[PDB]
Amino acid sequence: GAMAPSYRVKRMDIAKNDEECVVNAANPRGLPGDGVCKAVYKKWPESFKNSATPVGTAKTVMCGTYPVIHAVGPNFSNYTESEGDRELAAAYREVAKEVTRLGVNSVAIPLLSTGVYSGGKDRLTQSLNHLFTAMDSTDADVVIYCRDKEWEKKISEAIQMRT
């Protein structure tokens, strides 16, 4: 584990991360997709062999020796707010189990269900709080990746408030 486990946020493409493993914001069918998923497909295409997994789960596939944890958040256009909330929390719990199983000291993670699966709603606080609930008990250094300047400031504020 990391000596003093921390949370950090960076505004840049997760495909350029400096961590020991990456979490993909995957679709259930293991398709190249859009946004984060498409960037992950371009950088680690080998990790999409048999990566299909249900909503609310995570499935890790190696690209060489680099782990890609495919985490499937719900698409809020299809689920109710209640059911989608439950599946989003479940996907993050499965990411924490995989990060622990892998023995990594750091992990790069995007905010699940905040892009095209958001159902047109701002889900920064919802998704980030489920990330914290799952990852708080792990000892890996967590680096959250985002692309929006206002989201970077809000995620950074939420991290600092708890310290």
Annotated binding site, which residues?
13, 27, 35, 115-117
Contacting residue, 5, 8, 10, 13, with Cl ion by CB under 5 A: 13
Closer residue to Cl ion in complex, CB, 78/101: 78
DSSP E strands: which ranges in 7-163? 7-11, 22-25, 58-63, 66-71, 106-110, 141-146
Contacting residue, 148, 153, 157, 160, with Cl ion by CB under 5 A: 148
Instruction: Specify whether the CB–CB gap between 9 and 156 falls below 8 A.
Output: yes
Closer residue to Cl ion in complex, CB, 28/115: 115
Residue type, 60: T
Closer residue to Cl ion in complex, CB, 148/157: 148
Quote the tokens at residue 10. 């960076």
Question: Does residue 12 bind Cl ion (CB under 5 A)?
Answer: yes
Closer residue to Cl ion in complex, CB, 27/60: 27
What is the edge-to-edge ordering of all strands in the sheet holding 7-11? 7-11, 141-146, 106-110, 22-25, 66-71, 58-63
Question: Does residue 115 bind Cl ion (CB under 5 A)?
Answer: yes
Cα separation, 11 vs 42, in Å, equals 19
Contacting residue, 98, 117, 142, 155, with Cl ion by CB under 5 A: 117
Q: How far is the CB of 103 from Cl ion (least distance, A)?
A: 28
